[PDB]
Structure formats: C-alpha cells, structure tokens
Design a protein around this ligand. Sequence first.
Ligand SMILES: [Cl-]
Ligand SMILES: [Cl-]
Ligand SMILES: [Cl-]
Lengths: 105, 104
Amino acid sequence: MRFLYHPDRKDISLPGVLYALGDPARLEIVRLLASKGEQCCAEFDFAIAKSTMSNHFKILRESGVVLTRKEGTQHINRLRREDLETLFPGLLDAVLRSAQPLLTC
Amino acid sequence: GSMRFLYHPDRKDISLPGVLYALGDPARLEIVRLLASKGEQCCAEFDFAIAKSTMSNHFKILRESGVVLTRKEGTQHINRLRREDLETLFPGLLDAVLRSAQPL
Ligand SMILES: [Cl-]
Ligand SMILES: [Cl-]
Ligand SMILES: [Cl-]
C-alpha cells in the first residue's frame, strides 16, 4: 500500500495533535473519520480552496492524527485512533463529544 | 483587588477549534497546565520564549480564544484559567488535555 508520510508514534506530541484539531475544517475531518471510518479526500466537500485543503491534510498527517494512502487515484484517510488512544487516553472522546458538525448540518 | 480585565470573549463566542488552536503550542499548553495546578499567575512567571513579542502573542491567543482572562493589577498582568466557561462548553476537555500534558 502507498502510505503517505506519517510520523512514528514516538514523534507524536500533544501540542501537535491539539494544533491539528485547532481548525474547523480539520476538526470536521477528524469528526467524520471517527464516526464513518475511512474516507477519501474528495468526500470532504468544504467551500475551501484546493491548496488550503491540501495544507490541512498535510497538517493532519504531520501531527500524527491521520494516516493517508493512495488507492487508485483516491487519497484514503484513516484516523489514527489506536495511536492517539495509546498516547492521549480519552482525548479524542472529549473532543468529539463537543465537536459541532459542519458538513452533515 | 482589581476586576479590570483585558479583552476576553463572551462564553457564547468561544469555539472548540479556537480553544484547541490556543492549546496547540508547547509554550501555551504549559501556561494552561500551570494555571490549572497553581492558580492565578503573573505573566512574568512564563519565560517560555526568547522574545517578549512572542510571549505577548501567546497570551493574546490564550485570551482571544477564550482560555485565559488577564487582569491588570498595578504593574503586573495576572492570568486566570477560564475553568467554568471551558468546563461548561467542553465537558471533560480540560481534564483530558491536562492528564496527558507533559511539563515543558
Ligand atoms: Cl480523493
Ligand atoms: Cl464576545
Ligand atoms: Cl507580569
């Protein structure tokens, strides 16, 4: 599988994770990946410029939140739930409890 | 005994992404961690950057995002965690963040 860049768990920090979630578009991506499982980039039809969405997914990958792979021409994103729960127990649940939907609303 | 606070948003204007962005920095997370365990703290206690303009910007972000109040008292600026606002809006968030925050 063509996995895109992603850090090893050891190089994932709490400030980086909080930073990655610190954006309405990125929070909404994480919220949908958590509830619906893996989703290609094109499912996140935000009213947002192409280069900006690309930077968003780079931020999510560099921070250790999302694992992306190329399948065909799709970029398939996966929430790194197991890594995040191992490092930061209960963090995802506390964030997702309060995250307000955007794309489904 | 001053209740003279710098600009802070109303509870209704605090958003979860804005709060997470404010915590999403080693200096700012440590400020929040210290306010949470030690109580109110003067700005001069937080020597977490080479430049004073960098610390000023950290506190500006903490105040504008709804995490921190800043009180002007004499010559000092005293910071206070907005525990009630944050816990009412984002139940369990502060605990989850603080449980994993590592001392800087
Ligand atoms: Cl795609
Ligand atoms: Cl306001
Ligand atoms: Cl001060």
